[PDB]
Structure 1
Amino acid sequence: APAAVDWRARGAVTAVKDQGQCGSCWAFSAIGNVECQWFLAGHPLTNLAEQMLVSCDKTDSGCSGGLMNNAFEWIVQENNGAVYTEDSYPYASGEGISPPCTTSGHTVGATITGHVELPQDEAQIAAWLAVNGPVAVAVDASSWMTYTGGVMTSCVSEQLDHGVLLVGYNDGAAVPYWIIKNSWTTQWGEEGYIRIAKGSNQCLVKEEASSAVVG
């Protein structure tokens, strides 16, 4: 695999979003992944609608949490593969209450056919991401509240509680790291991103790595 990859530099990653006071991280993780996969399938970079999952994916629990894999399955199994544009289905859960699903008045922005579940192995996740693009992951982010930058080297790695998006890595740096997109505005971390040390399963990053497939 390449020594280093950063999908942001290819133009493949949308702007950092803001989940607000809702536990909808899982939806931002899944949607961010789809956004990138859709672009990498040869389509214009498009902001897609977390609110569609938060409100309409009843396998998951909206502002009380969810799984990215369930989101990918819901899109395929319950919405004919379709993901609406953010423009047509704006986020409406920032205060912590997700409104009822609305099926009308939205515009399809992307489609997916399925999803893959990646090995629990940082090297194999990196090799896959180098070729196929950004990957949704679950992490322990309990220690992330105060992060303002730098490579995180002592992440509390005890329980999965957050969903984020791997967009790159760097194996050659003095402390090798993952490059991770979060959903807590650009005011958090490194313009909304975090780097965590790579190779020691920091924050349990290898446990639940997956990606949508665009056909």
Structure 2
Amino acid sequence: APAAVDWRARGAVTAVKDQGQCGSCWAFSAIGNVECQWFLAGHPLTNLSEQMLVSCDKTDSGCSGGLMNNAFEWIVQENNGAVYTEDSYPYASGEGISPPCTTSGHTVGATITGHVELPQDEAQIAAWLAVNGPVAVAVDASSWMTYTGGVMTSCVSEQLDHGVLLVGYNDSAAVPYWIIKNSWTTQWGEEGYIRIAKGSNQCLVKEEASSAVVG
């Protein structure tokens, strides 16, 4: 695989979003992944709807949490593969109150037919990402609440608790790293991103990696 990849440089990643006071990171992770795959599949970069999942995916638990793998199954099995646009189904859960599901009246912004779950191995995840694009991952983010920049090398790695999006890596740096999109606005971290060291399972990053299949 190349020494370094950054899918932001490809124009494949939407702006950093704001989950607010809601445990909906699982939805931001899954939808951010779909956004990037939809662009890479030859379409304009389009903001897609986290609220669709938060309100309508009853396998997951709204502002009380969820799993990207369950979100991807819900989209395919319960929503005909459709992911609505952000503009037609905008995010409304920032104060912790998710509106009831509405089934009518939205605009389809992307279609997926499935998803992949990747091996629990940072090298294979990086090789997949280099060719195929950003990867949704679960992490332990408990120790991310003081991060202001640099490469994190001592991530507390004990319990998965947050969904995020791998968008790149750099194996040439003095400390090789992953580049991760969060959903805590651009006012946290490095314009909304964090670099964590790569190759030591920082933050349990290898454990639950996935990506949508557009089609």
Bin of the TM-score, shorter chain as denominator length: over 0.9
- Which residue of structure 1 lines up, in the alignment, with residue 83 of structure 2? 83
Name the CA distance, whole Å, in 1 between partners of 2:4 and 2:84. 32
Q: What displacement does 1:146 show?
A: 1.5
Q: What does the per-residue CA deviation read over 1:48-102, in whole Å, with 9 as the maximum and x for residues that have no partner? A: 0000000000000000000000000000000000000000001000001111011
Q: What does the per-residue CA deviation read over 1:88-123, in whole Å, with 9 as the maximum and x for residues that have no partner? A: 001000001111011122100000000000000000
Segments of structure 2 that go 5 or more residues without pairing to the other structure are: none
Name the CA distance, whole Å, in 1 between partners of 2:54 and 2:188. 22
Secondary structure of the corresponding residue to residue 75 of structure 2: helix
Name the CA distance, whole Å, in 2 between partners of 1:180 and 1:57. 25
Segments of structure 1 that go 5 or more residues without pairing to the other structure are: none
Secondary structure of the corresponding residue to residue 196 of structure 2: strand
Name the CA distance, whole Å, in 1 between partners of 2:159 and 2:27. 19
Secondary structure of the corresponding residue to residue 109 of structure 1: strand
Q: What displacement does 1:7 show?
A: 0.1
Q: What does the per-residue CA deviation read over 1:11-69, in whole Å, with 9 as the maximum and x for residues that have no partner? A: 00000000000000000000000000000000110000000000000000000000000
Q: What does the per-residue CA deviation read over 1:106-149, in whole Å, with 9 as the maximum and x for residues that have no partner? A: 10000000000000000000000000000000000000011111
Name the CA distance, whole Å, in 2 between partners of 1:177 and 1:117. 21
Quick check: 1:64 aligned with 2:89?
Answer: no
TM-score for the superposition, normalised by structure 1: 0.99
- Which residue of structure 2 lines up, in the alignment, with residue 164 of structure 1? 164
Secondary structure of the corresponding residue to residue 80 of structure 1: coil
Secondary structure of the corresponding residue to residue 196 of structure 1: strand
Q: What is the aligned length?
A: 215
Name the CA distance, whole Å, in 2 between partners of 1:145 and 1:22. 16
Moved more, 103-112 or 135-144: 103-112
Q: What does the per-residue CA deviation read over 1:150-192, in whole Å, with 9 as the maximum and x for residues that have no partner? A: 1001000000000000000000100000000000000000000
Name the CA distance, whole Å, in 2 between partners of 1:140 and 1:32. 19
- Indicate the percent of aligned positions where both proteins have the same amino acid: 99
RMSD between aligned alpha carbons?
0.4
Could you list the structure 1 runs, at least 4 aligned residues long, displaced by more than 3 angstroms after superposition: none
Quick check: 1:102 aligned with 2:121?
Answer: no
Secondary structure of the corresponding residue to residue 184 of structure 2: coil
Name the CA distance, whole Å, in 2 between partners of 1:38 and 1:187. 26
Name the CA distance, whole Å, in 2 between partners of 1:130 and 1:201. 18
TM-score for the superposition, normalised by structure 2: 0.99
Name the CA distance, whole Å, in 2 between partners of 1:29 and 1:188. 17
